[PDB]
């Protein structure tokens, strides 16, 4: 019917590859790989990708390609008792569009400020830097006070963030203007890129998702020439077979592969809903998983050879400088590293452009997925003015993200990252996989997969669809639900009330699923057996 397909198959492939990659393949994978096992981390990562990420990825991709509906309108034809998946996914996408875009705003501010022969973090001879200055080493004579900070750390904590004026999480300090202008610009770009649909989203992804790879290759070629750039490569490739015995390494690998491939979310499904019918969605899923793994691998290479160059110029044992867990690894350490190299300006520009284009495509994909979901759900009041209500959802994300644009917004973005995403999306994906496999029927799903492309998958894919991925997801949820994380940021410890607030925001999306199972039987009442058999049966087109 009116299914607006892509220009070419390579267009959808590039769009989904862009949705796959993000900052999390640069700031998270190398750090987690170094912490959990070192060089030997590749084995559990690849195992949990083969068993945990690729199966759910391909399952939801083929499901959305077959049924041709959004992540909310598909439950009418899959399992009407679980229509709250769409609403929970919209809530999670709102939380992400709120917190994640602040990283893009910071990167854009860094970019627009880096247009100077003297980088703003190569010397602290500025107004914001205080007497606690200790410039880059350049020698080993200088001693370091316990409170002494590098010029890039000072620039990141006082000027681009303005976090020194945060006297407590109970208040915010005030919304800054520079970060607000950068986020206004980036949201305007998002709105002018996702207004029409996949037709122009695919045209902008052609330069949005391909630009990170050329910058990554340039940075890798640079890292292949830096002095002492082999120490970091050796730390990245030094295996530790003893660390693999621990279960925390496997938990970290599973969490990383899940939040890198992003399976069972509702963007792959919304994209495949616009894909062709007889298209080979198996090869696409395979090549996307492979290219995401290879992108994470190359990003680990480049990041750790940069840290190795730093540990050669500075003191070695990169773990001494790689203490910041989060985006600070790209904002503090990498800034120092680029500042020490000659002609730092060009490399700063290309690196921050790589960050901003790694964020752009991911935000495009998420917002396009949620927009396609809400459009497929209400195609009468909406879908007549598609370019409308997109400005409305953009202003909604802006109003949700203004709380992160304050002076102490780093605490807010960390709280939203580590609490508003994990358990909610994991339980959502788990019960979605149960609905598609157990409730909807694994045999029926395999029959639809066979009829769609022309051949049914093997018994191994069925095992991964019915038992392996469910146990994987439930293992992750029971691991994350049994260890309340006392996370901190810049020595700002989070009290227990912050943990309660994070837990409340976390469940603020899952409860929408019981909402529908509660307020759906009010129109189809009756006995218990008739209701339990009417909730499971799908729609009859």
């Amino acid at each position, epitope marked *: 019917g009116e299914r607006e397909t892509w220009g070419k198959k390579v267009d959808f492939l590039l769009s989904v590859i862009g949705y796959a990659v993000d900052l999390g393949n640069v700031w998270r994978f190398p750090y987690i790989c170094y912490q959990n096992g070192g060089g030997a981390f590749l084995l559990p990562y690849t195992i949990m990708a083969i068993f945990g990420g690729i199966p759910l990825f391909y399952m939801e991709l083929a499901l959305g390609q077959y049924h041709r509906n959004g992540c909310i309108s598909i439950w009418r034809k899959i399992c009407p008792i679980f229509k709250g998946i769409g609403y929970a996914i919209c809530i999670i996408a709102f939380y992400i569009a709120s917190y994640y875009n602040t990283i893009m705003a910071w990167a854009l501010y860094y970019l627009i400020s880096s247009f100077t022969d003297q980088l703003p973090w190569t010397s602290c001879k500025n107004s914001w830097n205080t007497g606690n200055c200790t410039n880059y080493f350049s020698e*080993d*004579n200088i*001693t*370091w*006070t*316990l*409170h*002494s900070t590098s010029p890039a750390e000072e620039f990141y904590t006082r000027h681009v963030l303005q976090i020194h004026r945060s006297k407590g999480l109970q208040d915010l300090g005030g919304i800054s203007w520079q970060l607000a202008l950068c986020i206004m610009l980036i949201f305007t770009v998002i709105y002018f890129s996702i207004w029409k649909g996949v037709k122009t989203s695919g045209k902008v992804v052609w330069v949005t998702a391909t630009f990170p790879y050329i910058i990554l290759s340039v940075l890798l070629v640079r890292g292949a020439t830096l002095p*002492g750039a082999w120490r970091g490569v050796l730390f990245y490739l030094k295996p530790n077979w003893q660390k693999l015995l621990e279960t925390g390494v496997w938990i970290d690998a599973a969490a990383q592969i899940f939040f890198s491939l992003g399976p069972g979310f509702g963007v792959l499904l919304a994209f495949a809903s616009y894909n062709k019918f007889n298209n080979n969605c198996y090869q696409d899923a395979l090549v996307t998983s492979v290219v995401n793994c290879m992108t994470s691998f190359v990003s680990g290479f480049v990041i750790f050879t940069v840290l190795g160059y730093m540990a*050669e110029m500075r*003191n*070695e*044992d990169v*773990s*001494e400088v790689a203490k910041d867990a989060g985006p600070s690894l790209l904002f503090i350490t990498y800034a120092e590293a680029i500042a020490n190299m000659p002609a730092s300006t060009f490399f700063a520009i290309i690196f921050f452009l790589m960050l901003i284009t790694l964020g752009l495509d991911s935000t495009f994909a998420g917002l396009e997925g949620v927009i396609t979901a809400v459009l497929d759900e209400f195609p009468h009041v909406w879908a007549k003015r598609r370019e409308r209500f997109v400005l409305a959802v953009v202003i909604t994300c802006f109003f949700g993200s203004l709380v992160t644009l304050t002076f102490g917004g780093a605490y807010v973005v960390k709280l939203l990252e580590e609490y508003a995403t994990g358990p909610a999306v994991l339980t959502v994906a788990l019960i979605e996989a149960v609905a598609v496999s157990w409730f909807y029927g694994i045999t029926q799903f395999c029959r639809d997969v066979k009829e769609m492309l022309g051949f049914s998958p093997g018994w191994f894919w069925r095992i991964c669809w019915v038992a392996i991925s469910p146990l994987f997801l439930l293992f992750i949820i029971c691991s994350f639900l049994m260890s309340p994380p006392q996370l901190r940021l810049f*020595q700002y410890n989070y009290p227990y009330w912050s943990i309660i607030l994070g837990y409340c925001i976390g469940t603020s999306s899952f409860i929408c699923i019981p909402t529908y199972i509660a307020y759906r039987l009010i129109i189809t009442p009756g006995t218990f057996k008739e209701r339990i058999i009417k909730s499971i049966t799908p729609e009859t087109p």
Partner: antibody
Amino acid sequence: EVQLQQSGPELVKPGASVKISCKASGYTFTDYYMNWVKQSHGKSLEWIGNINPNNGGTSYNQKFKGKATLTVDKSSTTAYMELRSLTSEDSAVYYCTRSPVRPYYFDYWGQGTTLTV
Amino acid sequence: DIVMTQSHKFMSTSVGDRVSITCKASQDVSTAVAWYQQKPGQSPKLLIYSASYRYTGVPDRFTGSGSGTDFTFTISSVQAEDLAVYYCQQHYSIPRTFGGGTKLEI
């Protein structure tokens, strides 16, 4: 000019425990790491662990994971390290010393007390 | 761990000669090596850190160099008050560790 006080020796019986203090006099208490290090009778030095006086953080050795635990107090200007599971092989002189952040050299040491069994 | 191996615990010479000791590292260490002086009975005394920079309160007699794995701690014209068990400590990685040292004869 800068002295590092310490506790006194004690004939500790096998099974009991003992803690040793330290006083950073001459330089500020909360601007450099207060490391601890051990050496047996006529043997080599063995690092015990690191402590952060500003936030009470610590980073102990892998040979003293549960064997030793350290605490600090910037109000009383002390460094209380707790030693448990004492024996004869682990009973010798201990040292308290200062160290800045990431040149990691031990500038000034205490007078040195021996925890003999 | 990163074991700190040095010369023999007795390799030394008489008074007024060129004393040179080495400190081999299991892992390649660029400059993260220090040198402490253990006078008989007392605490170790820091002399040189980063393998090429003598800490304050030092006579010009103490010297030292080296990089990668072998660090050359050289000193000539030794006096009667500079004979002590010189330990070799590294700044490389946690858990940090010291060396063995060497007695001075004669």
